[PDB]
Amino acid sequence: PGDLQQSVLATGKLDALRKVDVGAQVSGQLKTLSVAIGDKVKKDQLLGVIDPEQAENQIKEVEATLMELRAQRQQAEAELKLARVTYSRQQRLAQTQAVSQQDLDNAATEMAVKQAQIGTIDAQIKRNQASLDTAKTNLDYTRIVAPMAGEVTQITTLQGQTVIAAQQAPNILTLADMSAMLVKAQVSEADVIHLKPGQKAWFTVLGDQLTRYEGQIKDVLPTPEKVNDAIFYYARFEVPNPNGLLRLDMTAQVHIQLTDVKNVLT
Amino acid sequence: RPGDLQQSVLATGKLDALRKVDVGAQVSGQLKTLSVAIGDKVKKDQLLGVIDPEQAENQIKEVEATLMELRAQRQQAEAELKLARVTYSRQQRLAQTQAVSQQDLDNAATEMAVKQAQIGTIDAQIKRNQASLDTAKTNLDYTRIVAPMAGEVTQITTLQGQTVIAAQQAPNILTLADMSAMLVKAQVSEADVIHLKPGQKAWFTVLGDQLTRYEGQIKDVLPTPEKVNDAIFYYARFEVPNPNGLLRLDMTAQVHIQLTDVKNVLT
Amino acid sequence: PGDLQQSVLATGKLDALRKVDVGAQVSGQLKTLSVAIGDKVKKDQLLGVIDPEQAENQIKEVEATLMELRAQRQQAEAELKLARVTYSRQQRLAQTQAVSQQDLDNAATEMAVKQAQIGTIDAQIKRNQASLDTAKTNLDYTRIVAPMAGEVTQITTLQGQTVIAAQQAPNILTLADMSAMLVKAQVSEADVIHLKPGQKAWFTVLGDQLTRYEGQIKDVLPTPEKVNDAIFYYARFEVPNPNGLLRLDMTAQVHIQLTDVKNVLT
Amino acid sequence: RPGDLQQSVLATGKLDALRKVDVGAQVSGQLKTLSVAIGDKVKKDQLLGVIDPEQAENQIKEVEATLMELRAQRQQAEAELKLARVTYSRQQRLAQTQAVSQQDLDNAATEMAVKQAQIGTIDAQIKRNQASLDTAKTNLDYTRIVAPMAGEVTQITTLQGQTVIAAQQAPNILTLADMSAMLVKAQVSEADVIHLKPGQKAWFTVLGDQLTRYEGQIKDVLPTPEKVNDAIFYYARFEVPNPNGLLRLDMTAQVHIQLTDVKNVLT
Amino acid sequence: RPGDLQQSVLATGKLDALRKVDVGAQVSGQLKTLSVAIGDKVKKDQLLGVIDPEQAENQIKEVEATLMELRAQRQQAEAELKLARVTYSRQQRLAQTQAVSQQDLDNAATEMAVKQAQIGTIDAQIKRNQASLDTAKTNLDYTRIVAPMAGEVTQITTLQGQTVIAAQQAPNILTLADMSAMLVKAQVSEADVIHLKPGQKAWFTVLGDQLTRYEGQIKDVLPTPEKVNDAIFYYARFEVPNPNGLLRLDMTAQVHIQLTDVKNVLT
Amino acid sequence: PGDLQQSVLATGKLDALRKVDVGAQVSGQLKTLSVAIGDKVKKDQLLGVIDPEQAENQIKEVEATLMELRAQRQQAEAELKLARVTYSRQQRLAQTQAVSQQDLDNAATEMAVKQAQIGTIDAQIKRNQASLDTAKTNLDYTRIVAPMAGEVTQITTLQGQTVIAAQQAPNILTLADMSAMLVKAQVSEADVIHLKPGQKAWFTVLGDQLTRYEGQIKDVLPTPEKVNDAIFYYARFEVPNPNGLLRLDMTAQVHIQLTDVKNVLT
Structure with missing residues (x-):
């Protein structure tokens, strides 16, 4: 009656919980924008107005x-x-x-x-x-207000520029919720069916490799992504970001405990 | 002297959705509400999202x-x-x-x-x-988006809040996918394609399953091959059940097909 | 009174006689498609219907x-x-x-x-x-029927997807006749003016190099194609494909007899 | 034993317009007249060009x-x-x-x-x-193009005579740029981004100015970083005056930021 | 001492249609009928295809x-x-x-x-x-497509059955090409372009014709050169008859131009 | 009381004074074009007509x-x-x-x-x-006339082709004035703030390296261009081209005298 269990290290990516890219359904010049990146907005806060x-x-x-x-x-x-x-x-x-x-x-x-x-x-x-x-x-429709509550991640369309949507919806700015973030972990196909929702998992964060973030997986994406011509799969879990720490695409070292059952003899 | 001829052929095939479809919209306006997540099974005609009506x-x-x-x-x-x-x-x-x-x-x-x-x-x-x-x-x-086929959301392109305009290119909300069964496109060589006939028995395993061999017969080939920089390859398809969740999209598979096996006869 | 004649080997490509890509002139959702690749259709057979x-x-x-x-x-x-x-x-x-x-x-x-x-x-x-x-x-116009009789080569637009043609005609599926095929042969410029309509020519087919296909050239394309930064020219002839054998872009070894006149002394 | 900890961090930052905007048009027709040149200061609302009215x-x-x-x-x-x-x-x-x-x-x-x-x-x-x-x-x-902000024409995309059609993509006549001040986007590493707090004192110089050190404090960071093939980098911004013409767009700069300097205390 | 100066200049030129044009359509609808093949001579205004009327x-x-x-x-x-x-x-x-x-x-x-x-x-x-x-x-x-110039179909882009929509980009049915004569764009160096004056006598041969030298005079140069990764090259054109079928598009040619030859005089 | 002054060599590019690309605001077939490259046109000369x-x-x-x-x-x-x-x-x-x-x-x-x-x-x-x-x-609007007086630099749209502007203005031909040309000189950032309007500068022209063209700078572009991943800056001056000599993108060797003040002791 011995033991047998295996962990899988993977490189993961940190992402925002909800990330949106505001659009305009109207054409004309964007008269006033009322945010820059870093401004935190409420849901339904007037983000900007195009020539009404x-x-x-x-x-x-x-x-x-x-x-x-x-x-x-x-x-x-x-x-x-x-x-x-x-x-x-x-x-x-x-x-x-x-x-x-x-x-x-x-x-x-x-x-x-x-x-x-x-x-x-x-x-x-x-x-x-x-x-x-x-x-x-x-x-x-000339009042570009928010579709969710978050942080102005980026402004691809600035005050002064002209926006015509006739045949393509524009991209004014993009918001994103940072409170709770996400950690899309790259766990190869060679070992994904061993990856099961609800398993341990913890990770560091390059700059400052000794603070640890706990978190049980609760997601897995059926859609893969090839890397170097080798198909992977994202594995996910939730980690709260009450402070600044952790940004978009900030790398991470993920740890996962597939099996752990103890005492049965290999 | 009596004998037998027969030739095998291994093949690095690929695995994917028995049925997949990308669902969009014929109307512009903003996507006010989107009721499904990156992984729910739906029933046909089920409502997935609504556009500003x-x-x-x-x-x-x-x-x-x-x-x-x-x-x-x-x-x-x-x-x-x-x-x-x-x-x-x-x-x-x-x-x-x-x-x-x-x-x-x-x-x-x-x-x-x-x-x-x-x-x-x-x-x-x-x-x-x-x-x-x-x-x-x-x-x-045309404002409410309903699932045209039953399956599970393999992805979500157009998020909730984003704004779509259908006048040029029909948008793309969320691809669905019937994973009930999974076709496996064994990519065989144009030098073997010569042979290989419908229903021909073949086996394969995934890189992470070691030995739990799966198998059936081939169903057809696709008239339109595709080159992998060099060498013209074709696709010999499969029909295997995918219960117990396993078999994810584009998951790799080591296929072996059994060209022929006429045994005991003048060779 | 001796001999002089020359052959030119070339790598050729096999292609379908007639190859079409069906389109829709209307927008909306493609309700029903009634073919998959491999279905052989008659000319004017209803191939599919978009929301009428x-x-x-x-x-x-x-x-x-x-x-x-x-x-x-x-x-x-x-x-x-x-x-x-x-x-x-x-x-x-x-x-x-x-x-x-x-x-x-x-x-x-x-x-x-x-x-x-x-x-x-x-x-x-x-x-x-x-x-x-x-x-x-x-x-x-909601009834997408065929423009010729052939084989469903590919379906780029599947049942369920939405099609809007307003500013670009879609591509539902593509048919192609395989009966008589084609063999676009690559014969370099260094020797094309020696290539004359009606000359011999035969070819094998990689997998199974000893079955031979006869055929006299009957075509030549004024439009070239550079390969590695070396301009070529397609040469053509017709070969019947009564069975399966021979598919689209199936490679081939082409042989051509430019000259053959015998006995005149070089 | 008493001491002090503190860590610096140099950084190859980039320099650019405090304010930049690209000005187009909502109407088609030909650009009959364009009154500015690749380098004039304008006042707000100033007229830059006219489209065939x-x-x-x-x-x-x-x-x-x-x-x-x-x-x-x-x-x-x-x-x-x-x-x-x-x-x-x-x-x-x-x-x-x-x-x-x-x-x-x-x-x-x-x-x-x-x-x-x-x-x-x-x-x-x-x-x-x-x-x-x-x-x-x-x-x-909408036929006469007027400067939406005060600055100097950093470029002229749509020339005088060329013909624009606004029905699809709004054209692009001439980008303006307030060069009064110049932000300097110090590209710091995602391994240092951890630290770096608003207003933190930093200095930098241009490759051609030798020693004429410039300096101030940082103003923020951009939540959206960007990879330079490898290594995830962020941008720690700057606010320095740019009189005397100097400091041109995308001009390179060798930045040094001063993470922290708590001195004299239990370390 | 009396003598003579003169400098030649060989040049890897290219060969192509004296006149080429791409014919499309102003109306949508499906291409119901297309009456020519990848290689027929047509007469002007001749009918090439019809769109669903x-x-x-x-x-x-x-x-x-x-x-x-x-x-x-x-x-x-x-x-x-x-x-x-x-x-x-x-x-x-x-x-x-x-x-x-x-x-x-x-x-x-x-x-x-x-x-x-x-x-x-x-x-x-x-x-x-x-x-x-x-x-x-x-x-x-506008439903019937007619040949705007006399020549031979160098290609067929839009096939018979395919469906065209002209609202955005005018389609492309079949390029025609007057091959009667063939211009040869000798690509000379920007270091020789300095010289080279209209009508200057030059000879060239194709890679597969060995020795059957062709020749005439140059007609002009194109103000707009073009770089071949490095070195700025220009195009010195030609006007040679192309009977007997020979001289196909983009066929390569080894050109030699004769800059000058003032002989017998104070050099 | 000695001397100190420095010159900066740079590779420059010769360009036309005014360069335009004529457009059509109408759709239909381009019936007649009345120029080929090399034709010199007056301002307001009918350059071509689309089906009226x-x-x-x-x-x-x-x-x-x-x-x-x-x-x-x-x-x-x-x-x-x-x-x-x-x-x-x-x-x-x-x-x-x-x-x-x-x-x-x-x-x-x-x-x-x-x-x-x-x-x-x-x-x-x-x-x-x-x-x-x-x-x-x-x-x-069916009469495509010129927007300036110059030389037909290029004809991207030829007689016979169809032009539909509905959602994108076409490009019929392009003119350019060659009289007075331009020499966008590449002077790196490592030494641009030393480059001051009104300074000397002269250049040769590869083919024929001993004829020299004088010219004082009178321009500088705030907008740079990276080369090999090294940001430069164009410096400009005017040189008259009364004859043919000097074409578009014809390379050049530029010379510039930043400082020259003599006698003060370094």
């Missing part, structure tokens, strides 16, 4: 169209007020003989068209409420 | 509205339908006593006919736009 | 527009029926004095407008027959 | 015109406004003596109301197009 | 139709033209006896004038669309 | 629309002629009692609408003058 002015005129243009139909209904309800008195007035001269039926029948039928009149316009006054909205959520 | 929602309201504008605008011609109708009648009666000639009888009778076509001119208006609504509804489907 | 549904709504939308004008003519011919009786009725009360000319002249002129009326609409009922057709041959 | 000039004239078509088309409804008005009045008077009932009084009084709405239906027409004019005017701004 | 055929029918809708819609105003005309007349006659004042005479006479303008409002409608028809007809030309 | 024919139909289409409104005004002024006589005629039967006021008031008000009538149309007859112009300066 033309998307604003696109609103003037609409609301104005909304006042046009607004004075039309006011022409429908005038017809309605008239065609509705003429009605009664004759509905009355009816039991008194002074209109008969015909005239009365042609008077009530207008009465109805005039009714179906403010209805036509109103649906239009309604359709455009939705043409103003759709022309507004574009001005909600 | 506030827009298509805005097109719909603009189209429903239009229907209603025509919805009432018909209500109007439905009242005219009764004026030229009742009068027609009422004038057909007085007409038997001789009311305003026959000219007027026709004139007004064909007035009930014009007004009758006015309604259809409308009913069709709706139907058309009722068909535009589908076209507005339909794009609302 | 929206190109279908594009039809509902039109036919409906075709019923609209269809009830309009039905409003033109009602006017016509009326304005054509009023005519006669007065054409008659004419020789009887009851209308004179004026009225009659204004009655015949309507008679004509009403005529030119069903004509206006009809041309419209006709224009749209051609708006339905044009909106239909697009639904004839 | 004959077109936007043509859109404006088409829109002003439209305003005028509505400008007169209102003048018409302004005369109707007086017919239904004066009559209304004049019929209210005769009405007290009993002119054509009350039916006609209303009918014509509400005629002055319909005609009254006709004007607004117009005034709004204008206002809309008065807002289209801004949209036509606004693009006329 | 069912569409432009559909635009035409939609435009001819429109003409007809206006073709009849005029036939209507041509009957009104006779009502206000005959009445005018007939009312001018009765008018001399004093029919319905003069007011009505004018009113109806100017009615023959309004109706008269109605026709023109139409005739112009047609003419416009008669010009749209050309625009519809014209695109039908 | 469709941009021409775009005019027929417009002028025709300009005749439509042209016969409309002719319908407005007929109404005007009528509604303006009826006016007077009653303005007169006014002081004679035969119209009163009402009728007169309804007659003058038409009189005004008819006035505001030729005005409506006229503004339209005017708007289109600007729709014809805008549709004309596009036919001014």
Whole structure:
């Protein structure tokens, strides 16, 4: 009854928990950017604005169209007020003989068209409420706000540059959460099926090789990467980064305990 | 003298997904929500992500509205339908006593006919736009990304928050992959390809499994080979079960194929 | 009276007679593909279909527009029926004095407008027959059928993937005829003008170097290709491939007999 | 025994613009005129180039015109406004003596109301197009290229005469650069990055200045490092004045940073 | 002492098409038919291929139709033209006896004038669309690919069946090439380029022709040279007949140029 | 009181004073090109034409629309002629009692609408003058003329080829002025701050190393270029090229005199 267990050393890479690259869905010049790398932002914090002015005129243009139909209904309800008195007035001269039926029948039928009149316009006054909205959520597109809470990792698009998305979404800046990081470990295929979720594992960090970071694996990527023409596989675990220490692509020495069962005889 | 001829052939083959597909989008906008992770099994048609829809929602309201504008605008011609109708009648009666000639009888009778076509001119208006609504509804489907096949996310290209524009190149959200079975592309030489016939029995093992030999028969070859700098190689495929998780993508494999073995006969 | 003739060995490449790469002219998701590599298809066999549904709504939308004008003519011919009786009725009360000319002249002129009326609409009922057709041959564009009869050489676009052609035609799959193949032979410039259409030539095939394939050249490509920084030229001939043997880019040893005239003394 | 620990760290850093930006265009057309040279200081908003505007000039004239078509088309409804008005009045008077009932009084009084709405239906027409004019005017701004920041033209990509098309990729006319100050990106090792804290005093010199040492403190680091084939390096930045012209872009610099120097104490 | 100076200069030149051009298309659709092969001589304007036209055929029918809708819609105003005309007349006659004042005479006479303008409002409608028809007809030309110059197909990029989309990059169907004559770009050194003057007599042979020397004079140089990793080279061109098929593209040639030869004189 | 001064040798490059690459803003086939490399052109000389024919139909289409409104005004002024006589005629039967006021008031008000009538149309007859112009300066876009006076350096786009600019401006040909050339000299960073505008400098030209070209520097580029992974800087001066001598990218040996002050003792 002896022992048998094996560890696998691997070179790993430290990465941010959540890493995003903000984009613009609109074209024009990036008027104002309000961050530089190092600024920490909240989720939904206005990160920058692209030239809205033309998307604003696109609103003037609409609301104005909304006042046009607004004075039309006011022409429908005038017809309605008239065609509705003429009605009664004759509905009355009816039991008194002074209109008969015909005239009365042609008077009530207008009465109805005039009714179906403010209805036509109103649906239009309604359709455009939705043409103003759709022309507004574009001005909600000139405001480049964040998709998550993190740190401004990089700004590939600076204040002053022009951005046209017509056929390719731009890349304004990129955020990333550093709190909890990640350690994509390179464990060759020659020994990945021995790598099982929930195993030990610890690592140093080149500069300062004696501080150690604990951590149990909890991930493995089905998608490999060839290195020198030798396929590997990332193995992952989580390590908290409450302070600065540990940055993007900071190398590491990973240690993993595949087997450890003790006393059974090899 | 009696004997037997037969020739083997080892081969450094590669291993990969029985079925793999890359799923994108036909609509622009930002990827507001993405519900799966780099390793979940999904069921077909399952929803994987949603793209900013506030827009298509805005097109719909603009189209429903239009229907209603025509919805009432018909209500109007439905009242005219009764004026030229009742009068027609009422004038057909007085007409038997001789009311305003026959000219007027026709004139007004064909007035009930014009007004009758006015309604259809409308009913069709709706139907058309009722068909535009589908076209507005339909794009609302193109905002939500659903898994076209069942498998496990082999990767996630377009993250959650990133912004896609589909006008040029359809984006790439997350590749799926049926790993149920795994084809193994044994890369044989163009000097052996000459032989090798469908269903020919072959075995192979992975570099890290030592001896746990796997095996079956070959299923075909791919007409389109590919050169590894020198030497033209082809691919002789495989169909082996991949339960128990094992067999990861592009995992290497040492294959051996058994060209032929006609034994005991004039050689 | 002796002899003089020379042969030129060259490395050649075997290729398919006709090789095509099917494309889509429409965007959307490729719903169904009905072939894998190895499937042999007939010319005009439906190879696959991209999401038609929206190109279908594009039809509902039109036919409906075709019923609209269809009830309009039905409003033109009602006017016509009326304005054509009023005519006669007065054409008659004419020789009887009851209308004179004026009225009659204004009655015949309507008679004509009403005529030119069903004509206006009809041309419209006709224009749209051609708006339905044009909106239909697009639904004839969701059906990716073959441009020739061959073998599915490769499928670069698989079932499930999205295809948008707006600014670049996609590549669904590629077919190729293998019956008769081709052998683009590499015969250097140092000796191409000696290479003449109709000359001998034979070749082996690496794996199995003793089976020989006959064939007289019948082609030569004016367009060269540099190799190691040395310009060559393809020379061609046809060889039938009734069976499997011989694949795309399968190497070969080509032999060519430029001269052979015998007995004249060098 | 008492002592002191402290560790230096030299570093081959690089030097560059405190502020740099690349200026393009949102409109196509040919670059008819470009007013600056590969080395002039500009003031903000200064005009650098103009793109062929004959077109936007043509859109404006088409829109002003439209305003005028509505400008007169209102003048018409302004005369109707007086017919239904004066009559209304004049019929209210005769009405007290009993002119054509009350039916006609209303009918014509509400005629002055319909005609009254006709004007607004117009005034709004204008206002809309008065807002289209801004949209036509606004693009006329997008033809003239103005300097978004003050500095000196570090380069000129799009020459004068060349023709740009902005529909895909926004072009690139001339990069500007504030050289007032110059950041120096000391590329330190990922094995030293561990240390190095904001404001830490450091000195450096250029390869051609021999000894004229420059110095200050570090301002930060960039979270996104970058590998030089091997070894992961980061960038510790600088803020030094660059008067007297010196310090050109990407000019090399030999940096030394002073990690720490706690002296006299238990080590 | 009397003598003579003169310096030669050999040069590894290259050979190619006197005239070459790449022919594409302005319209999308699939290449339904392609009538030439990788080596046929064509005549100018000859038809080489056709792109799926069912569409432009559909635009035409939609435009001819429109003409007809206006073709009849005029036939209507041509009957009104006779009502206000005959009445005018007939009312001018009765008018001399004093029919319905003069007011009505004018009113109806100017009615023959309004109706008269109605026709023109139409005739112009047609003419416009008669010009749209050309625009519809014209695109039908852009479906058939015709040879812009006479020569022989040096290549075929876009095959028959492949599908082209012209919206971004104009495709490439089949390059043509006038091989009648062949320019030979002798690549001379930037240290010799100094000399070399138009029309300067030079000879050359191909690597496989041994000795069958070809020769003429140089025609020019190209202002834009090109480096072969090191050494800046220019191109001194040639104009030699290429009958009997010989001289293929990019075929190599050993050129010798004769800088100068002023003989017998004070050197 | 001795001396001290230093020169810096550098490899330089000769370039053209002004170098442009002509573009097209229109798509279609390049019908005619009227230059080959070596042709010297004047500023605004028609360099080539792309297929105008469709941009021409775009005019027929417009002028025709300009005749439509042209016969409309002719319908407005007929109404005007009528509604303006009826006016007077009653303005007169006014002081004679035969119209009163009402009728007169309804007659003058038409009189005004008819006035505001030729005005409506006229503004339209005017708007289109600007729709014809805008549709004309596009036919001014089928004529590829020069942006400066120089020499046809290169023709990347030849007669016969198709050019579509939709999403990328093409490159027809490139001109360049050779009169006065330029000599971008490579003077390393190790010694650029010693390089001062207005200093001596002379250079040879490989082929023929004894003819010398004088020239004082008058330029320096803030933007460097790495060579072998060593950053340099261009230094410039002007040299006239009245003849052929000196071409694009013709190498040179540059000489520069940074310091020269004499007699002060080192």
